[PDB]
Amino acid sequence: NCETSCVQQPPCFPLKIPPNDPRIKNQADCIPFFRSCPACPGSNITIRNQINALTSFVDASMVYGSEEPLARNLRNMSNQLGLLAVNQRFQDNGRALLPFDNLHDDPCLLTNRSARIPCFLAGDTRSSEMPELTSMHTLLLREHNRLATELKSLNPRWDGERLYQEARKIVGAMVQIITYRDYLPLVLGPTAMRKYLPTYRSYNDSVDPRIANVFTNAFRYGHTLIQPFMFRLDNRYQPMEPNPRVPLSRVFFASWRVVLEGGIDPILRGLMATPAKLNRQNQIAVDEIRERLFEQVMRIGLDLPALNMQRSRDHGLPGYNAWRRFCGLPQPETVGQLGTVLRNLKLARKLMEQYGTPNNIDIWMGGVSEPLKRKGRVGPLLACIIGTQFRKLRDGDRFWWENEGVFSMQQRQALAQISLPRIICDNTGITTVSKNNIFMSNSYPRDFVNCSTLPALNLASWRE
Amino acid sequence: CPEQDKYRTITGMCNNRRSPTLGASNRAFVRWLPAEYEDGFSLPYGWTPGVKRNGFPVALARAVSNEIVRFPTDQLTPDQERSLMFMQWGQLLDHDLDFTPEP
Ligand code: HEM
Numbered sequence: 001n002c003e004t005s006c007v008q009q010p011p012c013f014p015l016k017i018p019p020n021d022p023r024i025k026n027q028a029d030c031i032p033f034f035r036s037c038p039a040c041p042g043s044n045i046t047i048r049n050q051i052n053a054l055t056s057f058v059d060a061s062m063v064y065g066s067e068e069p070l071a072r073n074l075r076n077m078s079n080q081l082g083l084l085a086v087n088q089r090f091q092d093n094g095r096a097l098l099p100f101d102n103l104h105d106d107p108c109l110l111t112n113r114s115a116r117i118p119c120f121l122a123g124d125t126r127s128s129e130m131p132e133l134t135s136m137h138t139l140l141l142r143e144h145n146r147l148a149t150e151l152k153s154l155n156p157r158w159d160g161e162r163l164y165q166e167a168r169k170i171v172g173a174m175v176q177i178i179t180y181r182d183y184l185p186l187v188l189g190p191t192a193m194r195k196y197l198p199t200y201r202s203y204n205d206s207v208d209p210r211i212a213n214v215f216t217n218a219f220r221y222g223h224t225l226i227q228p229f230m231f232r233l234d235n236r237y238q239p240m241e242p243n244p245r246v247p248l249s250r251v252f253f254a255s256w257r258v259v260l261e262g263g264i265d266p267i268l269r270g271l272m273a274t275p276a277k278l279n280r281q282n283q284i285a286v287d288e289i290r291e292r293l294f295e296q297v298m299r300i301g302l303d304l305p306a307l308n309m310q311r312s313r314d315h316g317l318p319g320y321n322a323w324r325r326f327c328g329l330p331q332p333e334t335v336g337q338l339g340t341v342l343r344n345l346k347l348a349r350k351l352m353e354q355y356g357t358p359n360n361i362d363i364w365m366g367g368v369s370e371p372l373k374r375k376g377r378v379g380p381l382l383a384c385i386i387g388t389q390f391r392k393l394r395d396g397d398r399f400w401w402e403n404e405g406v407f408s409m410q411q412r413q414a415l416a417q418i419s420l421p422r423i424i425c426d427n428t429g430i431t432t433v434s435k436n437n438i439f440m441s442n443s444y445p446r447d448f449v450n451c452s453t454l455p456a457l458n459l460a461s462w463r464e
Numbered sequence: 465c466p467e468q469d470k471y472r473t474i475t476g477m478c479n480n481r482r483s484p485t486l487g488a489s490n491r492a493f494v495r496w497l498p499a500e501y502e503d504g505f506s507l508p509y510g511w512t513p514g515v516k517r518n519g520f521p522v523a524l525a526r527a528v529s530n531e532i533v534r535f536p537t538d539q540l541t542p543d544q545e546r547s548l549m550f551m552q553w554g555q556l557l558d559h560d561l562d563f564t565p566e567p
C-alpha cells in the first residue's frame with residue numbers, strides 16, 4: 001500500500017515531509033516509496049542486496065528484452081523475415097511505431113482520458129516514461145527491421161532466426177560503438193577516458209561484468225542534464241507550433257503525444273538542436289522532476305533527486321567519503337576540506353548543515369556536487385564509478401564487437417563507419433542532422449549537415 | 465553452457481563461461497563496498513527516528529532536495545557544448561544496463 005499510505009511498514013519507506021516545505025504544506029503527508037526487492041527475502045543472515053532485472057551487457061537489451069518469453073513476444077512470428085513486431089493500429093508517416101502493451105494498470109491512459117493511448121511495449125519496461133525515450137526506442141526498432149530487410153536481399157537463403165540474430169548482433173554493436181567512441185569521452189572528459197578506459201586489448205574472462213549497486217545511483221547524474229520542457233521542432237528546425245515547449249510534468253507516460261502529436265521526427269529534432277541543461281553547483285536539477293515528477297499519474301508529484309537519495313539508503317550504499325576512498329581520492333573530514341574538494345565553500349556549508357559530516361553525504365548528492373572535469377560532465381568521483389563500471393562492461397563481455405571471433409576484420413572495418421545521425425537518416429523523414437559528435441552538436445544550422453555527407457553502413461561483408 | 469557460440473543469449477547467461485550467471489538478468493548486484501544499514505543487514509539509515517549515522521542525525525531526502533537541489537527555473541544555464549541527445553542517450557543506455565525491481 002505504498003502508493004497511498006504514509007506508514008513506514010515493509011516494503012514502504014515513505015519520504016517524510018520537512019517543516020516549511022515549498023510545496024507540501026501537510027506534514028502528515030509523504031512522498032511514496034517502495035523499497036527495492038531484496039535478493040534474499042526475509043533473511044536474518046544475508047546483508048540485504050538488490051536485483052538487476054536486466055543484462056549488464058551493452059547488448060541492446062532495451063530493444064530485445066532480458067527474458068526469453070518477452071524477447072519472443074517482441075518478435076514478428078507471422079513470417080521468416082527476422083523482424084521485430086510493430087504497432088498494428090498506428091504509423092508515423094507510414095513508418096513503424098512500437099507495439100502497445102497490455103497492462104493491468106496502464107499509466108499512459110491517465111495522461112489523457114479522450115486520447116485512450118496506452119503504453120508502448122519494448123525490451124525495457126520504461127519505454128513510455130517520456131516521449132524522447134520512446135522516440136529513441138522507436139528509432140532502434142526501425143533500425144533492426146531495416147537491417148533484417150537488407151540482409152534478406154543479400155542472403156535470401158537465411159531464415160527468420162538467422163536474420164533476427166544477425167541484425168540484433170549489428171544493433172548491439174552499434175550501441176557499443178556510439179557509447180564508447182562518442183558518449184563516454186563526453187561524460188568523463190579525456191584524462192578520465194584514458195585513466196578508466198585505456199585502449200581495448202582483448203576479452204578477459206576474469207573481469208566481473210556485473211553492474212555494481214553504486215552504479216545504479218551514480219549513473220543518475222544524468223538527472224542534472226534534464227531540461228524542463230520537451231522541445232518539438234519542424235522540418236526547418238523551427239519551433240513546431242502550437243506547443244513547441246511542453247512542460248515535462250505533462251509528457252511523462254504521454255504515449256498519445258507520439259501517436260497524435262506528430263510522431264518521433266519533431267521529438268528527435270528537438271533533442272539534436274536543443275542544448276542539454278548544464279549542471280552548475282547552484283542549479284543542480286529542475287523543478288519539473290523535483291516537484292512535478294509523475295504529477296498526472298500519482299496522488300502527489302514526486303521529487304526525483306530526493307528519490308535517488310532515499311534509494312541509496314534503501315540500497316545501503318556507503319556515503320560520499322567511503323566512495324572517495326574506494327576511488328583513491330582525498331576524503332574531506334570537515335566543511336573547509338569539502339570546500340576545497342568542491343572548489344566551492346557556499347555548497348560545502350549548505351551540505352554540512354544538512355549532513356553534519358562528508359561521511360554521511362548521499363552518493364548522488366556528493367557526486368553531482370563536485371566540479372566537472374575538463375571537457376567532461378562529471379567530477380572525479382562519478383568519473384571513477386562510471387569509468388570503472390564501463391571498463392568492466394567492455395573487458396568482461398565475450399561478445400564485445402572488437403573481440404576476435406565476434407565479427408570479421410571487414411565487418412569491424414564496416415561497423416567503425418556507423419554513427420547515431422546516420423541511424424536517424426535511415427529510419428526517419430529527417431534529412432538534415434547533427435554533425436559528428438551528435439552529443440556535442442546542438443545549434444542549427446551551425447552544427448548541422450545533410451544525410452548524403454554521412455557514410456551508410458556497408459553490409460557487403462555479410463553476404464554468405 | 466556451449467563450448468562454441470555465434471550469438472548472445474537473451475538473458476546474458478553463458479557470456480562468462482566460468483561463472484555463467486555473471487552479467488545475466490534477474491541476479492543480485494555486485495557490491496564494490498560492504499552495505500551500510502541502520503541494523504547492519506537490512507534497515508535503511510533514516511528508518512528509525514533518533515538513530516544517527518556516524519554520530520550524526522540522518523537528514524530527510526526532501527530537506528536535502530529543498531535546501532541544495534532547488535533553484536529558480538528562469539536561471540537555467542543551457543550547455544554550450546552538449547545537446548539534449550547527450551541526455552537522452554544516457555537514459556537509453558541506462559535502460560540497457562540496470563532496472564531495479566520493486567514489489
Ligand atoms: C529524462 C527523464 C528521466 C526520468 C523521468 C527519469 C526517471 C527516473 C526514475 C523515476 C527513476 C527511479 C527513481 C527511484 O525510485 O529511485 C530513475 C532511475 C534511474 N535513472 Fe533516471 N530518469 C530520467 C533520465 C535519466 C538519465 C538521463 C539517466 C542517466 C544518464 C538516468 C539514469 C537512471 C538510473 C541509473 C536509474 C536507476 C535505474 C535502475 O536500476 O532501476 N535517468 N530515473
Ligand SMILES: Nc1cc(Cc2cnn(Cc3cccc(Oc4ccccc4)c3)c2)c2nn[nH]c2n1
Binds near residue numbers: 103105127294297563
Ligand atoms: N527503475 C526506474 C523506474 C522508473 C519509473 C518507471 C517508468 N516506467 N516504469 C514501468 C511501469 C510499468 C507499469 C506501470 C508503471 O506505472 C508507474 C508510474 C509511475 C511510477 C511508478 C510506476 C510503470 C517505471 C524510471 N523512469 N526512468 N528510469 C527509471 N528507472
Ligand SMILES: *[C@@H]1O[C@H](CO)[C@@H](O[C@@H]2O[C@H](CO)[C@@H](O)[C@H](O)[C@H]2NC(C)=O)[C@H](O)[C@H]1NC(C)=O
Binds near residue numbers: 112114115
Ligand atoms: C488530449 O488529446 C486530445 C485529442 O484526443 C486533444 O484534443 C484536441 O484539443 C484541441 C483543443 O485543445 C482540439 O482543437 C482538437 O480538436 C482536439 N482533438 C480531438 C481529436 O478531439 C487534447 O488537447 C488533449 N488533452 C489535453 C488536455 O492536452
Ligand SMILES: *[C@@H]1O[C@H](CO)[C@@H](O)[C@H](O)[C@H]1NC(C)=O
Binds near residue numbers: 078084
Ligand atoms: C509481421 O511482418 C509483416 C511483414 O511486414 C507485417 O506485415 C506484419 O504487420 C508484422 N506483424 C507485426 C506484429 O509486426
Ligand SMILES: [Ca+2]
Binds near residue numbers: 055057561
Ligand atoms: Ca543489457
Ligand SMILES: [Cl-]
Binds near residue numbers: 086087088089099
Ligand atoms: Cl499493437
Ligand SMILES: [Cl-]
Binds near residue numbers: 215
Ligand atoms: Cl556497490
